[PDB]
Design a protein around this ligand. Structure first.
Ligand code: GTP
Ligand code: GTP
Ligand code: GDP
Ligand code: MG
Lengths: 61, 436, 71, 430, 439
């Protein structure tokens, strides 16, 4: 019951390598585009001025 | 993905292949019907010997040859009827009647073509063919003749594929036929330049082993075949089971054949102990390797003490540890009764497998957790060649039984050149054995 | 071939088991189980002794009834 | 920055590599799934030296796995941490070498190394600032010694300015497992001397001694032997990944250890190593570490260092410790044993300090020493080679694959030449 | 890790080994089936059994012994005896035809057919051992096959092993009481052989033990069994210090380094005390002084010889029980003070004393009484020449008319080897006579 369940109909109507891409690559929300990250943010008349300098080297990407 | 094809020709080859394949089926769990053991329950380890047919059963990668219909028909009638392919058990119509000329020039020609058809039909299926194994009885007409023809044709048809031969020469003094030296020397000529490795399997030594160890005073061919099958399984298990130190079939010729001419060698096995006294001793690796190197345990009737050692290949299956193997090897090297040739400082190739040997119901051995099978090349093998040479010279001096061979199409000068070939083969061993 | 077992008896450990092993203090070569293992193997092999001797005796008796019947 | 790529070849090389990555991953706190779960910035500050970052925040080693037979890398995936390696890096043949140097160096390895050379080019160019390469392989085997050295030759012509490092398992006559052992071992040294910048020799005979005598563990196995080598490998490049009082990378060691270009064969050792029953009797201190470090029985080679004279030595200390205590001990050992150190080079020991000890330990040290007593290993290999080659035993396979006897004669001479020219500095006087 | 291998050849050797191994099994607790009930012992750790028995890897224990004979009656008796499940089936080597009291038969014709098997067995046994101390051999000298096989085995082992020490417990024919009629011939030949190939020899003639059993044990009709029990007790007392902890431990190596002045003289007499029935044990105190006095008094000598006719070259005595070094020193001082026993001039000190803590064990159906003190004394004295001279006279009176020599000449042995054996004997008595003279 390993390769003896084989049939012509099953093979020719099956996708092996082009099915849905798995997780860890799905992670883009289709609605969010450019001009919406910044020009659709919310904006302020009085911002916040606090900025922190941590004693940790910045991660490189 | 690695496959070895076993060739069985002659009654002796068939009757040893029976035990070998029973052992393989039992060891891999395949029923005689060719299926997994019923609906009670794969590791893809059977692929070395068996092939999936695409629906259910497995088919062995073997072929059986004979000109006597009796043995093959009785095999077909037997309980292994449904295991083998119906057209893989090729049978003849008339026996060679212990005549080498008949089976090499008259009868075997009408069957070698069909055997080649079947062998290439088996070879094209496998993708990682490791080599070939051939089993034959030398002291038989059809056995030796068909083995000669098959080896000669396979060499030209395939080229660099390795071939391993497990031949049975006649015993020094005890035998069953009266003309066996003739076809013996003829097959020796045929195989000398055509086989890559030859392993000696004289029957007298195995009778001695059974009488001394298994305490059986009524032994038959079945025990000998079971012992040979155990040897084959120990040799091959590295190709299909996981181990701490693996050795492939290509890693025997490159370590036991110092020169292309010299490839005749003999094997040993240990422990061979009856259950009545089997494990009332410790069976440490040290004493089992000592028993393996003990001269009385040679599977061929030869004394290694009469000559130098060329190289040794020994494989342990069970729960051995490399440090214990090293200690045992050091002890053997320090032992003085065993001496090696000067130009071989290190002469041991060791393999370790974790699959313990399997037991067959109705057998004589005992269920060990440790075992060792050792194959050694030594210059002492020339004694059997000398004693076989002396036997032939007696009959050939008076033209005894020569008209039976001449009348079957063989030229007169075949005997003289075969004798010269034996002389040259003896020439090689003593020259290389002497110190420089 | 493959080396899927570190030894004949103990398999490859789980990843969580090897908490350290960056500094050489735990080697798992000291066994800590050799005595019990070999002691168990003793009787494990003794049972095989007894079994095989039993089938052997059965075999000689089965042989003997045949010559009795022929007599 | 200044990162290195790892290469392992052969059955022996893969087993050493597999245990090495288990040690490094746990040192950096990396799970078998590639997700960091450590405890400090320093475990992640310089993780790019050995690990490549992919999508999803997982880390994959930049190791290349190579062999001529598919069985072993079927097995490496079956062990712990076997799913870290990128499946694209696996390259394998279908037949194998069968303990034949010519087969792995001329016929099979030659036609297959074009593929693995491409992946190395991809890894080397991808990184920002390459430091060098490190290779683990065995000289006694066919594919490990044969096809491994051809890669070393091929890579050297493409990256001449990069440091090349090797860990070689030199076969010994005591624990011998192959009849054709001397031939391929002798041939590989010829290729190894002209290419490798640093070569550290390792012998199974010495490793067995350490387990039996020092650790006194009942049943040694390759799992234990590989563990000792892996610990030594990590200690050499420890300061490259962590802060320290005196930093020293692979390039700095090469400058301070190699006097002349053809003398680059070292012997390594690791300390401390103690048994279970002797752990509560010893005291972990700087004087105690250096006492065991220079011990003859502690070396990972079959050569006795008291039969020759040290040329240079290097010690890399790990842990938080005072600098004065380290420096005075190095001077102390040199003054008391002035007969074991060559005299025309004063103060021939180098010291380095790294503040991060191995996990579960407070102090540790690795030793790399260039000694003139290493000629013993080549001498015993040479005599086995000349004994077999005088009668031309086991030669038709090497000759049957295109190699001629001139290669064997030249390989013997150069290896003989190295021994003679390596002893010449033992008797040098000022 | 210290082991010895016991060699038993001939009917006398087999019958002695039976009692010896029974005593060893009872002492170390092994049941006759071979499976130990298992305990944590009472002395010297759980490694005591390693000296005589070897762990079989699966259950039982197998003794480090080999049995040799050509007449299969005693071998079959052992195989059908109570210890059938103890010994390995293939180490009880048996022949088909007896030598029939013929040294030539046992040395030249039907010996080579057994010596190869014996050497293979010895080699495989020695492979198991790690710290092999030496070999112990037991053989009757008045028997053809026993003497011939023992001599040939010693000849083979001398070149097979060499530096490994070999000890011998020979039973010479008694001065007047003997069973066979042609035993002088093979006794002379066997002495001629073993003199050059035996490291240490002990005389164990029958009559001394006969008189001892008649006197001390108050038993009128014992048999060979009781003699074998006494010999086994002597062996156990000799070898106890190897496996049992003691205040002063003496090895096999510390016998030849303290007892043989020269390699030519290694023939010794044994003595054992106290040996008395339980009926008479009700009265006396059994102190170290009286037991050593009983050991030294001549009538207790295990060999039919009188030490008062010669000098004491060296004495070895091993004490077992609750002995104390101060009290054994008191006994030694009293013995030295006594004037009846005199020592040779060039031996200012002539005692090597060993002390063991385990008291002697008892055997069911025995005659010896379980006591809390014992001592076994091995002495090397020049008085040994008297038995050699007596046997020389008997053999000369045999050979004056050339009797029974047809068999020896026709079996392959040349006629005059008796002359060379006689010359060796005469050289031996001359050596003993010359050694004992004062400087
Ligand atoms: N070891 C072993 N040898 C066998 C066995 N059967 C046959 N032989 C050998 O075969 C030799 C005789 O040849 P056969 O087996 O009768 O048949 P053959 O070799 O094919 O030659 P033909 O008789 O012409 O058919 C004997 O000398 C045996 O040594 C067997 O079962 N075991
Ligand atoms: N102490 C003692 N001596 C024995 C015993 N049995 C035999 N002997 C001695 O052995 C001598 C004769 O030898 P056998 O008993 O016949 O056996 P053997 O020495 O092997 O010689 P063969 O008769 O040829 O077999 C006798 O003189 C006895 O002194 C015994 O049970 N105890
Ligand atoms: N230290 C160590 N040595 C090994 C290991 N595996 C194999 N070896 C040694 O390598 C030698 C054989 O190497 P081989 O398998 O032929 O290497 P290959 O030719 O690359 O496949 C043997 O003598 C072993 O002692 C291992 O895991 N660790
Ligand atoms: Mg036939």
């Amino acid at each position: 019951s390993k390769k003896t369940i084989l049939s012509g109909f099953m093979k020719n109507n099956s996708i092996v390598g082009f099915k849905e891409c798995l997780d860890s690559q799905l992670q883009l929300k289709d609605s969010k585009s450019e001009y919406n990250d910044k020009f659709q943010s919310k904006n302020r008349i009085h911002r916040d001025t606090s900025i922190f300098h941590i004693r940790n080297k910045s991660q490189i990407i | 993905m690695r496959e070895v094809i076993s060739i069985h020709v002659g009654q002796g080859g068939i009757q040893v292949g029976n035990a070998c394949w029973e052992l393989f089926c039992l060891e891999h769990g395949i029923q005689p019907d060719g299926q997994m053991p019923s609906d009670r329950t794969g590791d893809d380890a059977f692929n070395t010997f068996f092939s999936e047919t695409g629906a259910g059963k497995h088919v062995p990668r073997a072929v059986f040859l004979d000109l006597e219909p009796t043995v093959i028909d009785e095999v077909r009638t037997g309980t292994y009827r449904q295991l083998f392919h119906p057209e893989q058990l090729i049978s003849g119509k008339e026996d060679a009647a212990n005549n080498f000329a008949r089976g090499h020039y008259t009868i075997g020609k009408e069957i070698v073509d069909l055997c080649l058809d079947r062998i290439r039909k088996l070879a094209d299926n496998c993708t990682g063919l490791q080599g070939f194994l051939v089993f034959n009885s030398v002291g038989g007409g059809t056995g030796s003749g068909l083995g000669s023809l098959l080896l000669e044709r396979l060499s030209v048809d395939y080229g660099k594929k390795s071939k391993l031969g497990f031949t049975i020469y006649p015993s020094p003094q005890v035998s069953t036929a009266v003309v066996e030296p003739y076809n013996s020397i003829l097959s020796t000529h045929s195989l000398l330049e055509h086989t890559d490795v030859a392993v000696m399997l004289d029957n007298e030594a195995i009778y001695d082993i059974c009488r001394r160890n298994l305490d059986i005073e009524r032994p038959t061919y079945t025990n000998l075949n079971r012992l040979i099958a155990q040897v084959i399984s120990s040799l091959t298990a590295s190709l299909r089971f996981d181990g701490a130190l693996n050795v492939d079939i290509t890693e025997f010729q490159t370590n036991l054949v110092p020169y292309p001419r010299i490839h005749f060698m003999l094997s040993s096995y240990a422990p061979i102990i009856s259950a009545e006294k089997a494990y009332h001793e410790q069976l440490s690796v040290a004493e089992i390797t000592n028993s393996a190197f003990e001269p009385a345990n040679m599977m061929a009737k030869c004394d290694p003490r009469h000559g130098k050692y060329m190289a040794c290949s020994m494989m342990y299956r069970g729960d051995v540890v490399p440090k214990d193997v090293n200690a045992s090897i050091a002890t053997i090297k320090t032992k003085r009764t065993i001496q090696f040739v000067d130009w071989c400082p290190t002469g041991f190739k060791v393999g370790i497998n974790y699959q313990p040997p399997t037991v067959v119901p109705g057998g004589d051995l005992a269920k060990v957790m440790r075992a060792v099978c050792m194959i050694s090349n030594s210059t002492a093998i020339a004694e059997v060649f000398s004693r076989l040479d002396h036997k032939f010279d007696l009959m050939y001096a008076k033209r005894a039984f020569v008209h039976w061979y001449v009348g079957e199409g063989m030229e007169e000068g075949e005997f003289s050149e075969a004798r010269e070939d034996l002389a040259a083969l003896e020439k090689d061993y003593e020259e290389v054995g002497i110190e420089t | 071939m493959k080396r899927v077992k570190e030894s004949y008896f103990r398999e490859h450990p789980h990843w969580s088991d090897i908490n350290g092993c960056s500094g050489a203090k735990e080697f798992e070569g000291e066994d800590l189980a050799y005595d019990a293992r070999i002691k168990y193997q003793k009787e494990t092999q003794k049972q095989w002794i007894e079994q095989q001797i039993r089938e052997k005796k059965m075999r000689e008796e089965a042989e003997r009834n045949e010559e009795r019947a022929y007599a | 920055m200044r990162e290195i790529v790892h290469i392992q070849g052969g059955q022996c090389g893969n087993q050493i590599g597999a245990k090495f990555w288990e040690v490094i991953s746990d040192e950096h706190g990396i799970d078998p799934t590639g997700t960091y779960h450590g405890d400090s910035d320093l475990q992640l500050e310089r993780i790019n030296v050995y690990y490549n970052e992919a999508t999803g925040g997982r880390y994959v080693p930049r190791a290349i796995l190579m062999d001529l037979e598919p069985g072993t890398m079927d097995s490496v995936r079956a062990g712990p941490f076997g799913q870290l390696f990128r499946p694209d890096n696996f390259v394998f043949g279908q037949t194998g070498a069968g303990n034949n140097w010519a087969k792995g160096h001329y016929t099979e390895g030659a036609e297959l190394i074009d593929s693995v050379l491409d992946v190395v080019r991809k890894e080397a160019e991808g990184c920002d600032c390459l430091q060098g390469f490190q290779i683990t392989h065995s000289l006694g085997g066919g594919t490990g010694s044969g096809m491994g050295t051809l890669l070393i030759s091929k890579v050297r012509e493409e990256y001449p300015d990069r440091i090349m490092e090797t860990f070689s398992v030199v076969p010994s006559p005591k624990v011998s497992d192959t009849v054709v052992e001397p031939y391929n071992a002798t041939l590989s040294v010829h290729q190894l001397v002209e290419n490798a910048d640093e070569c550290m020799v390792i012998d199974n005979e010495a490793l067995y001694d350490i387990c039996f005598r020092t650790l006194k563990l009942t049943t040694p196995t390759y799992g234990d032997l590989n563990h000792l080598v892996s610990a030594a490998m990590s200690g050499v490049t420890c300061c490259l990944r962590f802060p320290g009082q005196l930093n020293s990378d692979l390039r700095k060691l090469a400058v301070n250890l190699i006097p002349f270009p053809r003398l680059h064969f070292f012997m390594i050792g690791f300390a401390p190593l103690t048994s279970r029953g002797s752990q509560q009797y010893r005291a972990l201190t700087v004087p105690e570490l250096t006492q065991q470090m220079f011990d003859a029985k502690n070396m990972m080679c079959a050569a006795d260092p008291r039969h020759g004279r040290y040329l240079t030595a290097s010690a890399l200390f790990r842990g938080r410790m005072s600098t004065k205590e380290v420096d005075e001990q190095m001077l102390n050992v040199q003054n008391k044993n002035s007969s074991y150190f060559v005299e025309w080079i004063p103060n021939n020991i180098k010291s380095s300090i790294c503040d991060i000890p191995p996990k579960g330990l407070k102090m540790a040290v690795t030793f790399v020493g260039n000694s003139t007593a290493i000629q013993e290993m080549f001498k015993r290999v040479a005599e086995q080679f000349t004994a077999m080659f005088r009668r031309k035993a086991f030669l038709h396979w090497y000759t049957g694959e295109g190699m001629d006897e001139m290669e064997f004669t030249e390989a013997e001479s150069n290896m003989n030449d190295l021994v003679s020219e390596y002893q010449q500095y033992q008797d040098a006087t000022a």
